[PDB]
Design a protein around this ligand. Structure first.
Ligand SMILES: Cc1cc2nc3c(=O)[nH]c(=O)nc-3n(C[C@H](O)[C@H](O)[C@H](O)COP(=O)(O)O)c2cc1C
Ligand SMILES: Cc1cc2nc3c(=O)[nH]c(=O)nc-3n(C[C@H](O)[C@H](O)[C@H](O)COP(=O)(O)O)c2cc1C
Lengths: 177, 177
């Protein structure tokens, strides 16, 4: 696939199904993430691969987090069922470290860019996915499940799988200095 | 170039020179930027294209900002000459709005992703680019120059142009849930 094409036509897919990326195709996605912009080369991030059985555990953690958050049954139910919307979910956590001419937000930024890079790496390989977050990224139980320290932050839950689904116009968003 | 290849070998290039991407080449870069992930499609960004004489005013602003921040001689210097390190610069501002369903940081990361996408679009076309920031992204006069409101944020100064000069291992970064 052409790189420029990938970027200009990039799209997120929410309707995902098996097969999910695996073997080298999955490692290629993880490798793309490692190439995200990174101020001072701090590699401020960690990836969690959630497939098959993992989804069950991930389900339980999210439901627990919702309960603890004081969410109503409707919310708790949506949380418990969240993981089963894709065959694979990659959680991205920004692993930050005290300033280094690099404020915390920039380190979190790099981790974020990693999520997009991986989403694109899935597309480049015949797969697809969508970057999701939600209030549960701030849940203590959820954070603990992904080893979040005080300065760490869950930047996204990347849902991936085989998708089953006019030229962009940037003029309204551009100004010539 | 090959998509996967660009994602797995994405590199930033400092030390850039004339000519800068123009016409469809430049539009293709702005088009990629507006295809970044966007929670609730808020399109929380604005792209400031800086080139030619526009770089003089940018220089004046940065310089004024450094002096105001109390930076030393050498820092104020690098600040004033900064804009001339590339023929083209695109400043990306995160234009944030209260959403309740989309916290501020999520809109900021979408803008941040636009920068990466724009840097990649440049590379996909044979050009080079580097995402820069520094303490001046917070400077009142610089922010004022790019129409930043209290909730807006300068996420990066993307240097673009023609580059010079002629597989990662994610194992330690991957946890299997
Ligand atoms: C939010 C953000 C801000 C950055 N700011 C700077 C900067 O001011 N100066 C710089 O040399 N690199 C900066 N970087 C890092 C470069 O874009 C680039 O990733 C790094 O120089 C390593 O080169 P590579 O991208 O080829 O690995 C920043 C990265 C991010 C994500
Ligand atoms: C940090 C971040 C968090 C996001 N969280 C969600 C989410 O929880 N649910 C959702 O439907 N979309 C979410 N999105 C947006 C989607 O990933 C996607 O960009 C959007 O549905 C539009 O589709 P497109 O990417 O094809 O333009 C998020 C985007 C970012 C940058």
């Amino acid at each position: 696939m052409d790189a420029l094409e990938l970027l200009i036509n990039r799209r997120s897919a929410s309707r995902l199904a098996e097969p999910a990326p695996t073997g080298e195709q999955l490692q290629n996605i993880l490798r793309a993430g490692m190439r995200a912009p990174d101020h001072k080369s701090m590699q401020p991030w960690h990836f969690f691969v959630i497939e098959g059985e993992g989804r069950e555990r991930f389900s339980a953690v999210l439901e627990q987090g919702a309960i603890a958050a004081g969410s109503d049954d409707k919310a708790i139910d949506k949380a418990r069922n969240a993981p089963f919307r894709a065959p694979l979910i990659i959680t991205v956590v920004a692993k930050c470290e005290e300033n280094h001419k690099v404020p915390r937000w920039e380190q979190e930024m790099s981790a974020g860019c990693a999520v997009m890079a991986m989403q694109m790496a899935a597309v480049a390989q015949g797969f697809g996915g969508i970057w999701r977050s939600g209030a549960l990224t701030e849940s203590p139980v959820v954070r603990e499940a992904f080893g979040c320290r005080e300065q760490d932050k869950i930047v996204g839950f990347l849902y991936l799988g085989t998708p089953q689904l006019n030229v962009p116009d940037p003029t309204p968003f551009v100004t010539y200095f």
